[PDB]
Design a binder for this molecule. Structure first.
Ligand SMILES: CC[C@@H]1C(=O)N(C)c2cnc(N(C)c3ccc(C(=O)NC4CCN(C)CC4)cc3OC)nc2N1C1CCCC1
Length: 127
């Protein structure tokens, strides 16, 4: 009946960097997934109130979405590429945990995840 606050995208006391891998995660990985025809459900936090899914944030205790990831990358919120990759994987996994296997939303996440894996396969060596 209420949404939780979204994940943070700024934290001044959290150490952060820009690395060439993090730049790749923004310029190649996020950009590729964001433009995809099936990106739209993943471009912002789940609005469980509008969807009338009061159980969503009972099941999903570590929400993540590409809106959040985009803002984190734009703010250079991360220390390393692994932290950002973890956020994408959390997003996909949440979708697979909550939804019925085979449902259209799962097919959408799978399409995005296939591209994600293809891009991080070519993550550049650091520096
Ligand atoms: C929650 C479980 C499951 C899931 O795992 N995810 C991730 C999921 C996410 N979103 C949606 N839906 C439909 C949305 C899609 C897009 C938007 C969107 O565009 N919002 C924009 C925000 C900014 N404004 C200016 C314009 C509108 C909104 C959404 O819902 C309110 N459905 C999802 N499903 C399922 C798929 C079908 C039944 C629920």
């Amino acid at each position: 009946s209420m949404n939780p606050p979204p994940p943070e995208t700024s934290n001044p006391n959290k150490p952060k960097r820009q690395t060439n891998q993090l730049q790749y995660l923004l310029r190649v990985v996020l950009k590729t997934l964001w433009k995809h025809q099936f990106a739209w459900p993943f471009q912002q936090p789940v609005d469980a109130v509008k969807l009338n899914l009061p159980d969503y944030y009972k099941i999903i205790k570590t929400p993540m979405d590409m809106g959040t990831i985009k803002k984190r990358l734009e703010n250079n919120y991360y220390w390393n590429a692994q932290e950002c990759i973890q956020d994408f994987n959390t997003m996909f996994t949440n979708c697979y945990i909550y939804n019925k296997p085979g449902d259209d939303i799962v097919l959408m996440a799978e399409a995005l995840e296939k591209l994600f894996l293809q891009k991080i396969n070519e993550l550049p060596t650091e520096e």
